[PDB]
Amino acid sequence: NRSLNELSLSDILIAADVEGGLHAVDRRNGHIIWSIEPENFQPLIEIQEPSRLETYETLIIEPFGDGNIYYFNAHQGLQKLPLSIRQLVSTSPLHLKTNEDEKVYTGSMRTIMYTINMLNGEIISAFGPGSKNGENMIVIGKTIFELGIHSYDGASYNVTYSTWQQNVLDVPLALQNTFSKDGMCIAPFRDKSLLASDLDFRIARWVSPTFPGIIVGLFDVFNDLRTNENILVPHPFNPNKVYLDQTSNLSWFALSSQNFPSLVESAPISRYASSDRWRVSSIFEDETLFKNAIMGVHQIY
């Protein structure tokens, strides 16, 4: 546990999907060893805004890391804000009386730990502001943000954005996992799948089956052969368009090419991006038309 150098790279890999389910996929073929349904945890992003159909705007966050914020309005397509969800929460409470209208940003961030049996996928015990219960198992953390923005005109937001993560002990290991110890090297790919390529010359080796939702979180698992622990570390990632889509609860989310180069390149150009017969107003009056319009890849400027 001091130098990632010593430690077996396990054949297990751990994936999180955008609907907030957790699966263990086998690093050698992309076989789905087991999944856990997201009733067991929390939705990864759930944005609750004042209304897409009256105003032609929607709030959108990239469900990754700090949870970066983006925004789309039918008048000027998709924009990236210089704000992060963690970062906003970390600067509450903020009251701003623009001069004109005033907002109030009140935050909330929780921490939780689960220990899960690898072999199987059963949650052995769950800790923290969550539900405190009591071999070859693994312990995984998950931070959960929740920004509430309270505008007095009434234009009332309420995003909640959760995100998995290693035990903050092991995080110095993560700076050592600079490229897969393995030759392999796996990423989210098209149609809710993982694709694994070789490192040398970027060539597809395996494709996984489908996951209930797009895979947005990825973990290598190492073995301390002395202490016999299952320490887990994020899978590294290889060296300005973003791809939009929505979760099942209908919240919009982004995947930047910075973070999801591999997916965003295999992704179709969004209709809105392509033809103005899709940027006309009638379109954003209807939910289904809207969805169809902006889903896919745009290119922020």
């Binding site: 490229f179 110890k181 393995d182 030759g183 490192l199 040398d200 970027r202 290889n238 060296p239």
Partner: peptide, 8 residues
């Protein structure tokens, strides 16, 4: 393992 890695 001589694993080589994408150029700089």
């Amino acid at each position: 393992v001589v694993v080589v890695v994408v150029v700089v």
